[PDB]
Design a protein around this ligand. Structure first.
Ligand SMILES: Cc1cc2ccccc2cc1O
Length: 113
């Protein structure tokens, strides 16, 4: 299937133990997809002061369309030193590894793989 319904744990940036997916745009998009597939991916909602507390390159989920079954359709866009790889809609948040941190909510998405 081109898309997958996921419920992502929403984490507070100060709880996150592993603050990115790796060291290159291609690596972080790769790792993000593997963590999504394995159910070990979290979401941090972007506010003032969040991104400087996480590691570049960043992996964003962005709204890909204007919401089947409660799930917003999203796709992955990476960012390194102010350059984005992909073009999409509004940021829903930044993806990070999940290693058992307690979430504040769950965000239902329909993810383009
Ligand atoms: C991102 C992503 C998620 C998946 C979930 C279930 C099965 C396959 C998947 C492949 C993917 O690239």
């Amino acid at each position: 299937k081109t898309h997958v319904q996921l419920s992502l744990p929403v984490l507070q940036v100060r709880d996150v133990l592993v603050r990115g997916f790796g060291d290159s745009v291609e690596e972080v998009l790769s790792e993000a997809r593997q963590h999504l597939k394995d159910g070990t991916c979290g979401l941090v909602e972007v506010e003032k002061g969040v991104l400087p507390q996480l590691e570049q390159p960043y992996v964003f989920i962005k709204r890909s369309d204007a919401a089947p079954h409660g799930h917003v359709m999203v796709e992955l866009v990476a960012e390194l030193e102010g350059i984005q790889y992909g073009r999409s809609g509004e940021t829903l948040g930044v993806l990070v590894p999940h290693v058992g941190e307690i979430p504040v909510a769950y965000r239902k998405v329909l993810l383009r793989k």
